[PDB]
Design a protein around this nucleic acid. Structure first.
Ligand SMILES: [Mg+2]
Ligand SMILES: [Mg+2]
Ligand SMILES: [Mg+2]
Ligand SMILES: [Mg+2]
Ligand SMILES: [Mg+2]
Ligand SMILES: [Mg+2]
Ligand SMILES: [Mg+2]
Ligand SMILES: [Mg+2]
Ligand SMILES: [Mg+2]
Ligand SMILES: [Mg+2]
Ligand SMILES: [Mg+2]
Ligand SMILES: [Mg+2]
Ligand SMILES: [Mg+2]
Ligand SMILES: [Mg+2]
Ligand SMILES: [Mg+2]
Ligand SMILES: [Mg+2]
Ligand SMILES: [Mg+2]
Ligand SMILES: [Mg+2]
Ligand SMILES: [Zn+2]
Lengths: 69, 223
RNA sequence: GGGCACCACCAGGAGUGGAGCCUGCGGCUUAAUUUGACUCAACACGGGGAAACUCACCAGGUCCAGACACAAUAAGGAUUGACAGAUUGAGAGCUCUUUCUUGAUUUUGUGGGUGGUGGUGCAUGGCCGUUCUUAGUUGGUGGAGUGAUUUGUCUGCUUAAUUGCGAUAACGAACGAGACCUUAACCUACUAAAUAGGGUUGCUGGCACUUGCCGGUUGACUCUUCUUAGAGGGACUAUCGGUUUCAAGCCGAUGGAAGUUUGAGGCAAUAACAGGUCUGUGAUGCCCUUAGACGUUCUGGGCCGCACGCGCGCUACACUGACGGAGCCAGCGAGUACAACCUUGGCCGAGAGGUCUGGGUAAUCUUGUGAAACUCCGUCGUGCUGGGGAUAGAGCAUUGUAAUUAUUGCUCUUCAACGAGGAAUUCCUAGUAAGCGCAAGUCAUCAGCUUGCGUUGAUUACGUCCCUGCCCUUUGUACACACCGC
RNA sequence: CCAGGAUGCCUAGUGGCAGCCCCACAAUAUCCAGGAAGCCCUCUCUGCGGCUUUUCAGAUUAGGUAGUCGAAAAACCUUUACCUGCUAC
């Protein structure tokens, strides 16, 4: 057979940078809750917006926002 | 449904072939030989010839039922329109496929091959073949391949007396060292063939003549 | 010495080899122009006419399809997903920009599989090819040998044939050949038909105009010759003549549809070959490989490149023609409902091809596939000419996602080589050869290919061992891996 | 690769529908047998296949030996030959 080419640069699947008990949401009083950012208009509450410099999206609908918030 | 008649026929044939193949694959332990398909209105009768009929059956409708279900799944039929039956084979030794299967099984088990072949031949003879032949091909010891032929009686090679008379049976056998190719030809006796001619085309048996007494006067015998 | 064969030659035909062009295969070239196979038995073969797919090759990227076992994270996430533009060949989240999703699938290891048009056909199966479709092969007694063995299985003559007749330590047998089977031929003899064809007659069109001629209509009635295709017969070398130990047979006349094994095939023994195929194969041993794969999968190419060799092929070198009209006749087939098949009939278009409509799942419709080569009357007359059609340029079409490295078709234009091809060598013996087209196969689209089909239809043998091969016999053999020997 | 200059019988032909109208058959020698491109060859304008090599390998296959092929610098214009592979109830 013919020899393999060998440029060098390999690309692996990203490990994702997992993070839980994320700093979204808050509570001040104790009794009631204070939501941070916002929930989805398309789907029901529980899902939360992605916040960037005048650009939003959500993951349950893979990524489908446009309007600011 | 509703196609060119010839095309339909072809399709049916293909289906049958597939079924046969499946049976060969699956009913190895059971010692399957051949299928018989009767396509009437509503119901379709799938008859199965195997050695271990009981095994095929299971325990009053189980394995057979499963098979039926599988068939239905394959070919878009409904429950009721397929009917399987597992029947015995009238004389196993006259069958060729069955013999081949048996041989394969023996090989798998681990028996002296030549001896096994001889035994098979003997069995065939007992059953009542005019003659039979077994070829076992491959690496029967050593790396170099050999063919091993074991035969008894007559063996018609040429002509139409082959499709009519000789049942053939090929079957590969997988082992640790490699593959063994088993072929079996069983020349059924003409008298017990039923379908087609009951005798060879070249043989001309002449009946024995009957004696008479000449003269004994002119005479008469009136009523 | 004796056989046999148009894969041998005679007697002839058609040729190929030359010409151009197709296509195989070398050689070179190229990232890569994937590979298998080289006397017959490699070279239009791999059903291999590659536009991607196919595909194995190259440049590049994607994906896990890493089964299962066992631990490291075990939700303070295992890993799954992810629009936006840069990114990217690129509306490949391929990612690095991102900060949202996903919930224990996984995943990180370690046993363990799995896939591979990776390797090895000189590790195998099966299938195929070839010795060989030649006439060869075997054993049971019995005889000859201590024996391996031998005879049978053979001087002769026959036959396509170890086919027979004969002669005979051989007798009777089996396989192979033959028989067999399928098809191709005959049936005014049967069984049959508005899915096959006719006859009378109704209505009905035209004629001559007497009653007669051609028609068109599934209007009626009836038939089975042609049709089909069921069951049977029929050919057995039959009758006669010679010829041959008056045998096997062969040769000639007669009749007969048939007298070449009636023609053509299908199958086709023993023993084999280091023949081919591990690129048909969830046929497979072992090796290799085995998560940036030699797995897969996308994307763009490539098998098609050209100083040049050979191999199948087509087109022509014209006057037995060319071109126009006109005449006008086959047989094998094949053909869709979950697809897009064959596609008449009507209109548009010089064409190709478009359109509307049908008919057909098919002796019904395409289809009488009114195929060509042919036949008739005219135009050019033996000039590289109107022979010949290559290379060329342009446009018009179609197939498909994609046509440049013209896919193919059509339209105009360009008009090259080649005045029957040297040494060589192929094929052939009758509905054959050669010509001619059709036909399916592959097929979205492409025929110069192929398996068949019919149409037109000859010349010359009907022998021989000169060559070539093969077969036997007798001989010789320091060979037995067997002359590529020793 | 070449061509005829003239001493001459030529001969105003013989055949096939002679007729002019085409076909074929008939005219010794030739004297020269001569000219043009190519012509054994040697230096140049200084060519691409040798020289060794060192790196490897393609492989050549059933296995192996000896040679050969492929990518990198220096003067000169073959992939074959040969060794070795297998047995009874
Ligand atoms: Mg690669
Ligand atoms: Mg026989
Ligand atoms: Mg036969
Ligand atoms: Mg041959
Ligand atoms: Mg090609
Ligand atoms: Mg060919
Ligand atoms: Mg193509
Ligand atoms: Mg594969
Ligand atoms: Mg493999
Ligand atoms: Mg082999
Ligand atoms: Mg080989
Ligand atoms: Mg004896
Ligand atoms: Mg002998
Ligand atoms: Mg006679
Ligand atoms: Mg015949
Ligand atoms: Mg028809
Ligand atoms: Mg011209
Ligand atoms: Mg082709
Ligand atoms: Zn959403």
């Amino acid at each position: 057979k013919k020899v393999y080419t060998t440029p060098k640069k390999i690309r692996h699947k990203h490990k994702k940078v997992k993070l839980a008990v994320l700093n979204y949401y808050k509570v001040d009083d104790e009794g009631k809750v204070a939501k941070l950012r916002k929930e989805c208009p398309n789907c029901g509450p529980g899902i939360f917006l992605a916040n960037h410099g005048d650009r939003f999206y959500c993951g349950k609908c893979h990524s489908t926002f446009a309007t600011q918030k | 449904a509703i196609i060119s008649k010839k095309r339909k026929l072809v399709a049916d044939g293909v289906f049958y072939a597939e079924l046969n193949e499946f049976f060969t694959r699956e009913l190895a332990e059971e010692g399957y030989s051949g299928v018989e398909v009767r396509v009437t209105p509503t119901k379709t009768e799938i008859i199965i010839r195997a050695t271990k009929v009981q095994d095929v059956v299971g325990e009053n409708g189980r394995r057979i039922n499963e098979l039926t279900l599988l068939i239905e799944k394959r070919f878009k039929y409904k429950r009721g329109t397929i009917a399987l039956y597992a029947e015995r084979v009238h004389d196993r030794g006259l069958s060729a496929v069955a013999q081949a299967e048996s041989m394969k099984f023996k090989l798998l088990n681990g028996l002296a091959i030549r001896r096994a072949a001889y035994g098979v031949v003997r069995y065939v003879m007992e059953s009542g073949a005019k003659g039979c032949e077994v070829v076992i091909s491959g690496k029967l010891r050593a790396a170099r391949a050999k063919s091993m032929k074991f035969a008894d009686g007559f063996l018609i090679h040429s002509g139409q007396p082959v499709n009519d008379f000789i049942e053939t049976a090929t079957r590969h056998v997988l082992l640790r060292q490699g593959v063994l190719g088993i072929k079996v030809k069983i020349m059924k006796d003409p008298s017990r063939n039923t379908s087609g001619p009951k005798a060879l085309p070249d043989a001309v048996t002449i009946i024995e003549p009957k004696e008479e007494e000449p003269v004994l006067e002119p005479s008469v015998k009136d009523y």
